[PDB]
Design a protein around this ligand. Structure first.
Ligand SMILES: Nc1ncnc2c1ncn2[C@@H]1O[C@H](COP(=O)(O)OP(=O)(O)OP(=O)(O)O)[C@@H](O)[C@H]1O
Ligand SMILES: Nc1ncnc2c1ncn2[C@@H]1O[C@H](COP(=O)(O)OP(=O)(O)O)[C@@H](O)[C@H]1O
Ligand SMILES: Nc1ncnc2c1ncn2[C@@H]1O[C@H](COP(=O)(O)OP(=O)(O)O)[C@@H](O)[C@H]1O
Ligand SMILES: [Zn+2]
Lengths: 370, 370, 120, 379
């Protein structure tokens, strides 16, 4: 069917939907299911037992937040079906899923059962004309408009580094670590309890993510800022109460660059970028250092590019040019890539038709992926 | 009275010369704890080694000191040798002379620094480095024939005819047990079961040793794996959780025979064994086909010998008879050779003494290596 | 063992010989760890359908005065020995002595060295 | 050397005594009776000005070191037991009080969970700490606390005291002694915390899982007609002499259920162990599960250990925890001292080790020089 394809980013934190024609995603809402915290027997309470996106944000304190997708993998599929149904609601897009074809953006090196079940839902529950699963990293390059480039895509659920040179992705050089934005939000909650402010509730976890997003700066030297006495910058909560964050502000997102501090066995965001380049062939190393692209929401931390440049330089070889080319629209970079890809006439060949999936089998989605 | 100490990348096999099997066999690893700023409890060792670190895997970050038969961290290797002599063997290094094993075509600094420690740190009376492949022949009571000694660190092919080695015919391949273990993690992550940490990698090695087997026809085995669930076997983890690895069982050891899977762009363990025989003199080829030995624990995969014979026979001429030598004790084939060598009265002269080391230096080892 | 390890490590750092092997390097007490019960004793069925006399059960204050085995029932609660009191003596930061009390403070209101702001 | 003192400053009660003893010498409510104030102010209070906190702790430590313990503070060392993730400024103040005012030789800031493990003798064990403010859990594996896999919920003493006060005010039946033989509701606007605590301990108990699960659905009234078990008899409690409060049988066995209630989120005192254990490393699972430790005075409540261990094994079968923690054998450790005084006993056992104490502990000479107490946060 010729009618405009619907791009949808499967972001663990925020799913971004919209049409391929639009330069930006019109409808982007948080990826969580909202049910009433108190188990509702009586009338005059929150009805439906389902609150998604803007409806949830309004009555947030009353509801109990449950993320359906963890570490770029779908844990509860029933929840994810309701989320994708809300994408084709009167609230967002307001269209038939049966008419328009779909593009998914699954993280690299995900389970094959995750891709197979994702297709089954979108072909059976929704009567889609055609579906195409793609890598988040490959899209990010289409948006910026360069063929060569390493893509350090720091999402909410997973942070992954994929090196692609002249439209060729080395699949062995891909590096994936689970320590992402959501873990930084979890570790900030621990440090906020060490400052003396508890956020025990699942609703109260959402305002820790807001505190992180508002006020958390990455110091170039962490040891100097610790010895220096903090200003203790006040943050205002939804109720109106003030909280002085203090040293927790800067030593929370540090755990990205040094995850051994809390006690998580991972490489680190500076390390995975360098290791991904060093794993690739010697001839390409210089060009891959010379073309690095930051993607996702967990790069927007104040002074992230400043710290990463410094942490990469000392690990990388001496007298090598390191350009970390961040776009202005890092959060919405992954979708814009899909929107451009979808618009091209080549995409018509790439996607798998509904009749193709019935005849060919299950492999059809996997083999056409690349 | 003399000590044989195999310095394998996977496992360190140590024991007394003359004995049938090695006394102490432990995994060659150093376990440093994921410590926070919180104070630690009692009975705390700063760095654990071997069977102790194998018991306390959960918290300790497992760091293999020897990578591809090259000692990367010498301070770590020193702590293993200290655990080998004093604790495991219960013997003074000053009393007994120590035989060590190095893989062929290793860096010259490795053999140099190895002996320097044995002479200075441990104060050994005599020290001789030997090629692992040269020892492995003595195990089978065969002077003539090639060996395919595939270890955890490296795999090497050393052709030796009538007690005379062909140095230029020796070929080294970096593909080994640890690369297969790393490969098995990736394909298990594709199935669903994610293993990231250093402790988890050790559990994946236990899965590999028990279940994984070499297929005769890979394409035929993949067809049976797709249709029937007969090859699918269950394994219980340290946790009560059980996993069904399926087709990935026989997919892991395939990487040996076709490195393209791992993405090394090199010849297979079958093809390198053929290439090594062809590099040798035309006359002696006959005996090398007739006496092809498989050594190390990477040749203890069920049915590697059958697959090896098939692949060599196809490459080799039709008239030639290809017999693969697979003794029951392949894991301890390097050590048992060392025990036979050290015991022989002829070898008494070949030892490098302290007096010889003191006058000449550590460079003397390169002359009296092989 | 940790003291000897820490001492041996510290004198090796102080020496700064880079762990030079001059001489040869390198009875045990083993406690059995407490056995874990499969099922802990349930609440007795008496507690259900029985009048609770507040005289029989003990309050928190009198429970906590006997901390070694704080008993719920009154019949278990034994009388503890009477707590000894203290005779304070003050000493300043800059100054040394200030005031103090006799060795027979029992049944005495005399100060060995009388010093107070109202008395100067 | 002298036998080092052990102090354990809590919101409800403080444990005090000397090292190498069977239990604590003094255990008292953590408050101070200041002139003018009718109700005594609480000594530990998080999120206040440092100067006001300094004065309260100075006043409290003085009472511990002279009226309760009889020993010179400057002479002998200190072993300060405080829970992990204790507020930064509070711990900084507590040390600054001991080092500046009292001039103690050296303080050792031991985490309560690691101390509780020493008392049993086992090197690795899961430790739940059901205290006054928050019920915290922290897996300890072979001496190393795993901060990565922490867990806390506000289902302790404070949350239980508040729940009791609410229920009593609804079904309020007091005999004032002024033609108040008839049921009189809410004669007093609020009930003092001292009374509520005494009612909780004596009257209220923890129900069986089978009876408790019915009580949860009963008070909910989820399309059912009077589906509650038969309650215990109503107990009459004196308030301030003349006023006799008749405590309803339902309140006794319903007040506790707020701890073990799911409340949609699936966040109980029971769930917190399994939520933490699932997040732990795959190798550590079977060792931690087999070695459970239940400290804190909230777990002293009669029939708590049976309900918890039962509620665990029920929540195991639930589909979320059924995959990972399905075929696991959960066994509880019985510590030598009582559930309240497990934390203290560890510090005393540790305090008896004079050789290790001096090395690990922070000396006054170091603090006066630097002015930087070591913590699990960055240095
Ligand atoms: N029965 C088995 N089946 C399959 N793989 C095995 C088996 N036993 C061991 N392995 C794998 O092969 C490796 C064999 O290591 P081994 O014990 O031979 O020591 P090594 O370090 O390789 O020494 P060397 O290089 O001297 O042979 C192990 O690390 C493991 O990954
Ligand atoms: N301005 C910001 N500053 C700091 N962190 C941010 C900011 N915006 C988003 N984040 C973090 O990044 C997350 C968004 O990740 P996102 O880019 O949507 O991932 P994905 O690429 O998988 O869609 C948020 O949940 C938050 O943790
Ligand atoms: N022996 C006991 N029996 C029953 N309940 C008790 C007992 N001792 C204390 N409690 C209750 O449990 C709580 C335990 O708190 P505690 O652990 O002493 O404080 P903290 O957590 O601040 O160290 C008290 O507030 C009290 O309500
Ligand atoms: Zn003076």
């Amino acid at each position: 069917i010729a009618n405009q394809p619907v791009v949808i980013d499967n972001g663990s934190g925020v799913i971004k939907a919209g049409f391929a024609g639009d330069q930006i995603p019109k409808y982007c809402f948080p990826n969580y299911v909202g049910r009433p915290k108190h188990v509702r027997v009586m009338a005059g309470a929150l009805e439906g037992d389902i609150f998604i996106g803007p409806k949830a944000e309004e009555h947030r304190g009353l509801l109990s937040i449950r993320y359906p997708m963890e570490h770029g993998i779908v844990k509860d599929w029933n929840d994810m079906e309701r989320i994708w149904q809300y994408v084709y609601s009167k609230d967002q897009l307001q269209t038939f899923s049966e008419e328009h074809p779909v593009l998914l953006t699954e993280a690299p090196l995900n389970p094959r059962k995750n891709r197979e079940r994702a297709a089954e839902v979108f072909f059976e529950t929704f009567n889609v004309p055609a579906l195409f699963i793609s890598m988040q990293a490959v899209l990010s390059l289409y948006a910026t408009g360069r063929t060569t480039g390493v893509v350090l895509d720091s999402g909410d659920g997973v942070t992954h580094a994929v090196p692609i040179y002249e439209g060729f992705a080395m699949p062995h050089s891909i590096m994936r670590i689970d320590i992402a934005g959501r873990d930084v939000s979890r570790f900030l909650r621990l440090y906020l309890r060490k400052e003396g402010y508890d956020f025990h509730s699942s609703s109260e976890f959402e305002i820790v993510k807001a505190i992180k997003e508002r006020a958390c700066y990455l110091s170039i030297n962490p040891q100097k800022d610790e010895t220096l006495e903090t200003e203790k910058a006040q943050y205002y909560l939804p109720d109106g109460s003030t909280i002085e964050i203090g040293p927790s502000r800067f030593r929370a997102p540090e755990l990205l660059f040094r995850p051994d501090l809390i006690g998580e066995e991972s490489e680190g965001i500076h390390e995975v970028l360098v290791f991904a380049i060093q794993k690739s062939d010697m001839d390409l190393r210089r060009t891959l250092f010379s073309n690095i692209v930051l993607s996702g929401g967990s790069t927007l931390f104040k002074g992230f590019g400043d710290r990463l440049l410094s942490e990469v330089k000392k690990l990388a070889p001496k007298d090598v040019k390191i350009r970390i080319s961040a776009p202005q629209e890092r959060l919405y970079s992954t979708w814009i890539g899909g929107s451009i890809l979808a618009s091209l006439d080549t995409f018509k060949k790439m996607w798998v038709s509904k009749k193709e999936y019935e005849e060919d089998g299950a492999r059809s989605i996997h083999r056409k992926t690349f | 009275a003399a000590l044989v100490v195999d310095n394998g990348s996977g496992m360190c096999k140590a024991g007394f010369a003359g004995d049938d099997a090695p006394r102490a066999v432990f995994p060659s690893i150093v376990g440093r704890p994921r410590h926070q700023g919180v104070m630690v409890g009692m009975g705390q060792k700063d760095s654990y080694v071997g069977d102790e670190a194998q018991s306390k895997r959960g918290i300790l970050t497992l760091k293999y000191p020897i990578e591809h038969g090259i000692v990367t961290n010498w301070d770590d290797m020193e702590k293993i040798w200290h655990h080998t002599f004093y604790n495991e063997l219960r013997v003074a290094p000053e009393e007994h002379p120590v035989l060590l094993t190095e893989a062929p075509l290793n860096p010259k600094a490795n053999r140099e620094k190895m002996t320097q420690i044995m002479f200075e740190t441990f104060n050994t009376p005599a020290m001789y480095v030997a090629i692992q492949a040269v020892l492995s022949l003595y195990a089978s009571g065969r002077t003539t024939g090639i060996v395919m000694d595939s270890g955890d660190g490296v795999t090497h092919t050393v052709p030796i005819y009538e007690g005379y080695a062909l140095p230029h015919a020796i070929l080294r391949l970096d593909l080994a047990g640890r690369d297969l273990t790393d490969y098995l993690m990736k394909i298990l992550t594709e199935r669903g079961y994610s293993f990231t940490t250093t402790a988890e990698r050790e559990i994946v090695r236990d899965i590999k040793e028990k279940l994984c087997y070499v297929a005769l026809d890979f394409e035929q085995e993949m067809a049976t794996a797709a249709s029937s669930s007969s090859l699918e076997k269950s394994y219980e983890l340290p946790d009560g959780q059980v996993i069904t690895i399926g087709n990935e069982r026989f997919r892991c050891p395939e990487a040996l025979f076709q490195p393209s899977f791992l993405g090394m762009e090199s010849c297979g363990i079958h093809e390198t064994t053929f290439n090594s025989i062809m590099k040798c003199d035309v006359d002696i080829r006959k005996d090398l086909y007739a006496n092809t030995v498989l050594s190390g624990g990477t040749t203890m995969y069920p049915g590697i010998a059958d697959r090896m014979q098939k692949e060599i026979t196809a490459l080799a001429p039709s008239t030639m008879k290809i017999k693969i030598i697979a003794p029951p004790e392949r894991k301890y084939s390097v050590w048992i050779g060392g025990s036979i060598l050290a015991s022989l009265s002829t070898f008494q002269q070949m030892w490098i003494s302290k007096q010889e080391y003191d006058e000449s230096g550590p460079s003397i080892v390169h002359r009296k290596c092989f | 063992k940790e003291k000897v390890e820490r001492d041996r490590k510290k004198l090796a750092r102080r020496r700064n010989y880079m762990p030079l092997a001059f001489s040869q390097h390198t009875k045990e007490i083993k406690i059995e760890p407490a056995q874990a019960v499969d099922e802990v004793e349930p609440l007795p069925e008496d507690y259900y359908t029985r009048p609770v006399n507040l005289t029989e059960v003990t309050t928190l204050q009198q429970r906590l005065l006997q901390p070694d085995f704080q008993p719920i029932c009154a019949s278990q609660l034994y009388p503890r020995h009477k707590h000894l009191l203290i005779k304070r003596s003050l000493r300043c930061r800059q100054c040394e002595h200030n005031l103090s009390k006799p060795e027979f403070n029992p049944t005495s209101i005399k100060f060995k060295i009388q010093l107070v702001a109202v008395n100067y | 050397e002298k036998t080092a003192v052990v102090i354990d400053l809590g919101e409800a009660f403080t444990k005090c005594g000397f090292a190498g003893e069977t239990g604590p010498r003094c255990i008292i409510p953590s408050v101070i009776k200041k002139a003018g104030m009718p109700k005594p102010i609480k000594v530990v209070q998080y999120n206040i000005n440092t100067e006001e906190l300094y004065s309260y702790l100075k006043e409290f430590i003085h009472i511990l070191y002279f009226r309760h313990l009889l020993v010179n503070p400057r002479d002998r060392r200190v072993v300060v037991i405080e829970s992990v993730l204790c507020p930064s400024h509070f711990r900084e103040t507590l040390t600054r009080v001991l080092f500046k005012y009292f001039e103690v030789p050296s303080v050792l800031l031991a985490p309560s969970h690691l101390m509780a493990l020493l008392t049993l003798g086992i090197n690795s064990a899961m430790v739940l700490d059901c205290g006054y403010r928050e019920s915290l859990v922290l897996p300890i594996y072979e001496g190393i606390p795993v901060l990565n896999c922490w867990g806390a919920l506000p289902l302790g003493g404070k949350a239980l005291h508040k729940e009791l006060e609410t229920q009593l005010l609804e079904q309020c039946t007091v005999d004032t002694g002024a033609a108040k033989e008839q049921s009189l509701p809410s004669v007093m606007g609020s009930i003092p915390e001292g009374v509520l605590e005494d009612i909780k301990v004596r009257t209220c108990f923890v129900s069986d899982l089978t009876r408790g699960l019915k009580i949860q659905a009963a008070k909910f009234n989820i399309d059912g007609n009077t589906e509650r078990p038969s309650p215990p008899p109503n107990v009459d409690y004196p308030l301030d002499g003349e006023k006799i409060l008749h405590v309803l049988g339902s309140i006794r066995d319903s007040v506790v259920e707020i701890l073990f209630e799911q409340d949609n989120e699936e966040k109980s005192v029971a769930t917190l162990i399994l939520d933490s254990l699932m997040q732990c490393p795959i190798d550590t699972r079977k060792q931690l599960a087999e070695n459970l430790v239940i400290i804190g005075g909230t777990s002293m409540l009669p029939g708590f250990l049976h309900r918890l261990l039962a509620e665990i094994r029920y929540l195991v079968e639930k589909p979320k925890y059924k995959k990972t923690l399905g075929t696991k054998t959960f066994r509880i450790h019985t510590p030598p001292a009582k559930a309240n005084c497990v934390a203290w006993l560890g510090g005393a056992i540790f305090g008896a080790l004079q050789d290790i104490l001096g090395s690990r502990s922070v000396s006054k000479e170091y603090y006066n020089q630097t002015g930087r107490i070591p913590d699990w946060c960055s240095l």
